[PDB]
């Protein structure tokens, strides 16, 4: 990497499971109380990480360096609809707000996000279309160094199976907050005044290999509680605006 | 709206009223009672049940005697002081609100809330997202045209200017982070049945409107745009019915004269 | 008032005040509490009793005139140290409060709270806003005159000076952000049934009262005004009835002499 | 009164201590707990037992003797934290089950975390929930209180001059005095409040005022004060007791020249 | 003692020691008991989470000593708590499983010697099981501060988290950071980022110095309670990653 502008943007859709053509942005209803010895969750019940590869102007070595990102979760006010489908809070009361466990995560890199597998239950039998830890053992419930993967397929890597790998990701920046619990309030902020700098302490940002920029996200907002009492994950899309400059390699 | 050398500062003050629905003449600042449990396939919210974005265009003094000149002057918005007005009104637990228990006081306003403002030199630009794309919205509202299942996530068709007061339902629209190059917007959504409202007042806080290059919103055709949504939470009537409560937002915006090409 | 330089000399006075709260004080024993809260009055017949309504506290601190000939000198407020007094009194869970469960301790004070202070060179300027414009307020209260539905959002008619102690109900009035050019105010409202009180004491915290140009509130008529509201939450009696509980607020204000033009 | 910091050999010292909590200690085995809490006493007949009332902790630390013809020790920094926060992860002993087949109920609810460093005893102001409370022998509480003692009564001034005597519910640090002390307290009230406690040997509180002057130690004595009521322990029966923990202090001091 | 500075990186994933009640429930404790009288409180080994520790040997440089300058650390697998289909009690009829929630402790340390610990007990009369190292000759004063209870974190899976805390009166040659959050319904809140570095230099710019060419990492990451369908509860813990930058420092003999 030697010394030494353009902007790209993306709306990245969430991958919550989409149990039918009308329920884009939701998961299938949650099952409960499967014994660890017989836990076979359906594909459409499992939120997955989102990713997109963004092609950049080819340059000939000059490389695009990501310098800043602006990002926010899109449609947060949609949760002020308490008239459609949600269980009443009490008799004559309005609908129950989306609430409970949530995960808000994004990454910007010059290559796919590197992940480490960890499982609640190693004996989980994951469905076709999902990519999950291979040859899991009891150690897969703590740290098992076999479970390395690239975030190289959209709507494939279940959020519950994978985390950003802090032992890799030399050429990406990632940020995530997990908040667990049945009554957790969603707290989401919007502003066009907030920028994250992507430069390390030596002043270098993600360098885009094969003229490619990779954005990654997961934005599980909480659980939607139907009138029947059934629960579904709700997700929202994440906007990215990335400022890049030419750097000489 | 009070609108008061080359270093001339104009201060624009205004109190923007909330638009929560106002279901009768006595419940200004409240919505109609919330319905619940409408199947997605038959969800027809009443007009007066839907809080909408508040907005106003504030005309500014004309700056340019000669419209033919190489350079023109524009009002540039440099700072805003803002706060929500009448937050103490929620200490009235004697009127209309369900008792917390037998012999107890009234239930405080609480639950999901949204506190949002914008200051720009053109209308706020908005992106539509829906809980439920099959929602049938009522006459008087402006809501995403020809929504699809993709409207429940991101559908780039749904672009609008916040160009009408009490028309754009908060539940359908967010500020568009892909536009608004000539506006600053700030919002926080806090969801949940029991969320406590937390609101601060002080005449000592100022938000700077200058971007990275030190440039504020530039007021196009001498027009300053203020936008707000202040849903404080849900009021619970003795019956158990719930209504949105909103409050007005004050703005004090300082502007200077910028030369442009 | 044209503001000139700070008058330096061999002479920064400090003044201090403990400002008692005005929660309603329903009898001789219940100083610091309101009357039991009523519930479920229809908006059309809402007549709260005076002793049920917390009011803004205010005191005027008199200062010596500085002018040998009626250029002049005014006292300028530079800083304030302030804190809520007796926060630990809520650790009394043996007196009066409803058991949390059988064989358990008393229920803590909790729920909606408001913590507000101001320091000005003149009375606090307030703006009226009502939950219910049809509320019939009791003798001894000063509340918005000729309210309309618009009084439930913003009605610019409702301007008042905080010119009387224990008269302006907290539920009717907020500091006016469109006035108070000669005062600094700070408030946080936290609403809800089960809100925990969170209160900090420290003698290391100073609020600077100086504006953008380094100018504090000026005591135009040789008076300093301190204003407060400290509703800590609701006390729940064994019976189920609820009362507001308030606590006094301490102020210590650093003053200097400021030159101004006649 | 205050001149230059004196440097030289032996112009700096550090002192440390662990101050035990004073939660009431209802028997020889329940050190660090209170007696079970009563409830619903009428204000007119409120007679709390001594062992039910947590009190402020205080200790005097002697410093190397300095000469008066003035040189004084100046407190510059304090490192402090609450000791034994992980003991609350014992959910097997004595605590009511959260539900059938469940673990014990964690300690939770109203808490107060307070410390002070001064060159004289902490100065306190009295405020009462109920001015008619009848406090027990062995406690020092607001003397001859009135209805005003429920808000602010300026008669209630005391020095924190006795360990395990000044009940926390009766007294606060007096912000109108303590010219020669720094204090820091947080009260969080409510039945379900979670304890939140941080430990780290990398956090330092600076005790210097805006002029760069720390507490000055009169007669070569340093005074530490604390209250760390962590919350309520719920027994199997439903009875509740306060739980407190010790507090560590590490105080760095330097010599300061002063003119009497 | 400590003179001029003369760079190497080491990394570790340290497993949690939550009790591991059977070969399938690695990362969990045995179900919690409740309501033992203080006079008859005999917790099983597998029910007690313990501090984790690893010693990392470094090249023998001989004085010159290895000096720990920075640490990046992260709890690993926080998203696994989004599995609400495996084994958790339903929140209500037709509902999803109950999240892990309740009392949690998140702690780490980097030192040039074993972590120095201080013993404090909920109940001094607690009778601890074989394989655990707990306060010796405890008294009622062991429920507050009893200075007898000093120990080195010198063994992995032995020192129960409920018995021991880092000693603020020692650990001159280590840096430690911990937060305890107690309560029935406390929400786990965990952040991941590869952009966060902790500086380990003291006031004089000296990091921990690796006595006998050993670096010591210590942790406890009790995430909260898992509630089984039956109502029984188990602690859940997760591994902690460490990446430590070290430099050579000249010292006097
Ligand atoms: Cl794998
Ligand atoms: Cl549209
Ligand atoms: Cl009026
Ligand atoms: Cl006294
Ligand atoms: Cl020991």
Numbering used by the authors:
A (entry chain CCC): 34 to 37, 44 to 99, 107 to 295
B (entry chain DDD): 32 to 35, 40 to 296
C (entry chain EEE): 32 to 42, 44 to 102, 106 to 297
D (entry chain AAA): 33 to 101, 107 to 297
E (entry chain BBB): 33 to 38, 44 to 99, 107 to 297
Quote the original article.
The E73Q pentamer structure was almost identical to that of the WT (RMSD in the BC loop region, from amino acids 68–76, of 0.5 Å), whereas the E73A mutant presenting an alanine in the same position showed some structural changes. Mutation of the initial glutamic acid at position 73 to glutamine in the E73Q variant did not modify the orientation of the BC loop, while its mutation to alanine, in E73A, revealed the flexibility of this part of the BC loop. In addition to GD1b and GT1b, they showed binding to the ganglio-NGL probes that contain α2-3-linked sialic acid at the non-reducing end galactose as in GM1b-DH and GD1a-DH. The two variants having E to Q mutation at position 73, E73Q and VQQ bound, moreover, to a wider range of gangliosides of both a- and b-series including GD1a, GT1a, GD3, and GQ1b. The overall binding intensities for E73Q and VQQ VP1s were higher compared with the E73A and the WT VP1s. As expected, infection was seen for WT in cells supplemented with GD1b, but also for E73Q and E73A PSVs under the same condition, and infection was also seen for E73Q when cells were supplemented with GD1a in both LNCaP and GM95 cells. The ability of the E73Q variant to infect cells supplemented with GD1a was consistent with its increased infectivity in RS cells, which carried GD1a gangliosides. On the other hand, only variant E73Q showed strongly enhanced infectivity in RS cells, which as shown by mass spectroscopy, carried the GD1a ganglioside, and only variant E73Q was able to infect LNCaP and GM95 cells supplemented with GD1a. Similarly, in 293TT cells, E73Q retained infectivity equivalent to that of WT VP1, whereas both VQQ and E73A showed significantly reduced infectivity. Therefore, flipping of the BC2 loop, and not loss of negative charge at position 73, was correlated with loss of infectivity in 293TT cells. This led us to a model in which the two different structural effects of VP1 mutations at position 73 have opposite effects on infectivity: loss of charge increases infectivity, by broadening ganglioside binding, whereas BC loop flipping reduces infectivity.
BK polyomavirus (BKPyV) is a small, non-enveloped, double-stranded DNA virus with an icosahedral capsid formed by 72 capsomers, where a capsomer is an association of a pentamer of the VP1 protein linked internally to a single copy of either the VP2 or the VP3 proteins. BK polyomavirus (BKPyV) is an opportunistic pathogen that uses the b-series gangliosides GD1b and GT1b as entry receptors. Viruses sampled sequentially from these patients accumulated multiple mutations in the BC loop region of the VP1 protein, which is involved in the direct interaction of the virus with sialic acids. All variant VP1 pentamer structures were globally similar to the WT VP1 pentamer with a doughnut-shaped ring composed of a central pore surrounded by five VP1 monomers in 5-fold symmetry.
